[PDB]
């Protein structure tokens, strides 16, 4: 339900829910449908018992009751009145709650999948640390990815376990007008990451860990993303192989040392 | 509709939506339910008036703009049609107006209850008071427990009334990248629960509170929580079992001396 | 559209919105109920026309069309079938997507009501000076109203213009675990309302701002209530009558001088 | 998708959604319209197929089963029954569930239209600088437009590219009681405008950038926004109209040297 190895309480339920808002549109929808059968079917079995019959239409039998169902729950009433019992009504109005109630659930998950904060950013598969202006810094380097924004960025470090305050991988700019990020931070004296060789870290189970935050002018969500860096993804002496008026994407990744 | 006893303003009303938001799932719809009926008999008890009858259907009477009623209220029009007279007619449009708007509020409270934020935080039953790296130190630990978080956490000392702002029980790191938090805070000089024992709090009615706070990146919702440890909760010299990779919540609120 | 005396642009629409979710609840469904009538007729007046008649019902003419109407815009389609022309049908189906369309902008404002944040601050009608522990400190005095908070409160102060900085009327505490908060400041040197006296405030025009902001948990909405004390209102000094285990509110702005 | 030319990944689907929320509402319902239609005739030529008839309505032919689906996606049932035979079912019932689909996601989009923040802050079509107090100081003036709010504002500086970090054009206060701001921040020797000329900027492409943010208390949302101002725009050596008691905001934008 989390990231490595968890043993704590849940709840099929809830569980549930999550999927509901984190699986693929038509596996959405197929999801209902699905749904929609099997609760069409144990309306319809329910329907061929009682204390009289119920298909008074085309259908000679279940077909018929599925077919009427499949006019009540989805409450659209189509025209072929069994209202002629009562058992026969009452399974026809405990239906009729249901699937009015169920549109609004379902109703409900959607716009509960709209919500979804919309922009994410993405983050260089590897850090790099390179002389800069003068001293040894490190670098990440981020980018939006659909709908812009225009954040601001804390730069947490681990080793030993002690999560280090390291100057924000922004320390130079704690934010930016994003539209292509470049996070950086110097390695002097004042910074955790003084001497530390790639050997240091290693042991350290040394991690590199990038957050940013922005709102979505388009929604006002203020919607984070974070990125974990792990010790041997920080390639030395390297730089990120430019970009660039107007950026084209596909090597964002990649590097070369200097 | 408060924390230990309130006199004040108030409405009936609001109190309702309260519970709406509030209350179990089935106690839910059985509510709706239990008001459909309710709502399906006054709309059936103003048919049986008039100038004119009604139920031209399967039932004699009653049960018939009963069951007449649920095909309009909910809207689903099945098929027997009485639209007869005029005050008959008023009736059935009064109701098909209201169940639309009441199919609403439903649908709306659904959406409102699904809006409750989703994540929450839970805390050691104890806190506890260690000597660390050095001098004495406090410790407290929360974690996430469904669909995670990454907070920021302040935290407040209650004596005997005034509240005193203890370095955040998180006086070394007031965030961190929450999936197993342990807020802790050194109690040298600076601090106000400085030179006090077991029999010092005791007679304040001393108390630690704590809140964490974060975003939930799923829903971008900042949901926060509390918790408060009465003096006799804070267990002195000794620290939390450890519970790691994997954590293992089982064990979560356990501690041994030292 | 705001606060004393505006001439800018604007536009019937939105200023609609608003009242959409500024009125009162049954103003409110009056609201579509009157607009739902209106709404019928326009599309019955819209069916004695054409190259056919409509009203195959009950109903000889007009109140026909409207009780069918009212079958159709709500979308309940019950039983007596007039798609007997193509003239016919359009209007009949030009209705069907509005209704739906309509009772979807309902359901729509309907949610969009319920949203509306839902604590409310309310401040002492009265702010005061008084001496407190030492030196002259000011006061103002402000507490929950329906489902609480914990909020933090920034003060600030209107003279000549120029909005001074004053140490938030929280000067002492910037926050608090609010369910009864009395917000203060001292008013030695560093603070702009030293030597000043009611007459000194009184020619400036002079001004008490503030503002408390808190998270709702219930619904984790952040929502903030300002306040605005004119300098006569400032009662000199004075305190406020104690109020308190419980709390009853009846005389929460009264005051008495020392 | 973004700002000055861009070659990334994308996804039409989203980028619907994108139209989805920024069109006018009448181009939308007429989307909506438009798609109505064009979901109506795929269901009456997927009609006039299987293994029999279907429009056993008014129409003839086509003309029928349109105005039958008319009927059942929007789910009105009206009430000339079609379920004579299975396929003729079947394609019936795919429909209901869609329609009934359909209606949720456009109910849906909706509210989340209605969503979009609804404040908006306006700025000075141009920027000052003028001596005030003593000193040198730039000046920069927005208020809002329509629901009000009470926000903070960064105020960053771009020359050449560095982003420099002016005192916030806020500089004197960073936050203020907005209902008219008049942004500002003072030239000396700490800023980085120091000692520099409308033709010192001009070759520097400067470029005066300002974001205010506050929440909208009517519906909690932050909602911030930002604004420009190229070199040539900071008019020099003048002041703003004033404005006010009342403020004309048909004047907002004017200036006067000094
Ligand atoms: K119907
Ligand atoms: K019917
Ligand atoms: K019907
Ligand atoms: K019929």
Redesign the interface.
């Known amino acids: ?10 709840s099929v339920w ?1 569980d549930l ?2 999927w509901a ?1 984190k699986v693929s ?1 038509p596996v959405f ?1 197929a999801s ?2 699905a749904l ?1 059968v099997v609760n069409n079917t144990l309306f319809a079995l329910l329907y061929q018992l009682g204390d009289a019959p119920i298909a008074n ?3 000679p039998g279940f ?1 018929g009751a599925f ?1 009427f169902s ?3 729950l ?8 069994h ?4 058992y026969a ?1 009452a399974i026809a ?1 405990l239906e ?2 249901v699937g ?2 169920g ?10 999948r ?5 922009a994410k950013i993405m983050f260089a598969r590897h850090a790099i640390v390179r002389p800069f202006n003068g001293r040894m810094t490190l670098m990440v380097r981020a980018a ?5 924004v ?1 954040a601001e960025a ?1 730069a ?1 470090m ?1 080793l030993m376990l002690m ?1 280090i ?1 390291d100057l924000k991988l922004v320390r130079n ?1 704690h ?3 994003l ?1 292509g990020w470049n996070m950086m931070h110097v390695i002097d004296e004042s910074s955790p990451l003084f001497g530390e060789t790639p050997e240091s870290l290693a042991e350290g189970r040394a991690m590199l ?1 990038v ?1 940013i935050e922005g ?1 979505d ?10 990125h ?1 860096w792990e010790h041997d993804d920080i390639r030395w002496h390297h730089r990120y192989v430019d970009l660039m ?5 596909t090597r964002f990744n990649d590097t070369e040392p200097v």
């Open positions: 339900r989390e990231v490595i190895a968890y043993g704590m309480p849940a809830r829910y999550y808002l549109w929808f209902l449908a929609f239409q085309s259908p077909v077919f499949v006019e009540t989805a409450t659209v009433g189509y025209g072929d009145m209202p002629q019992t009562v009504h109005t009729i709650f009015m109630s549109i609004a659930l379902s109703t409900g998950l959607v716009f509960a709209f919500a979804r904060p919309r939006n990815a659909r709908q812009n225009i804390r947490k681990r999560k305050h700019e934010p930016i007008f539209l860990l957050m709102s002018e388009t929604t006002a969500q203020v919607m984070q993303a974070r974990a008026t107007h950026i084209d994407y």
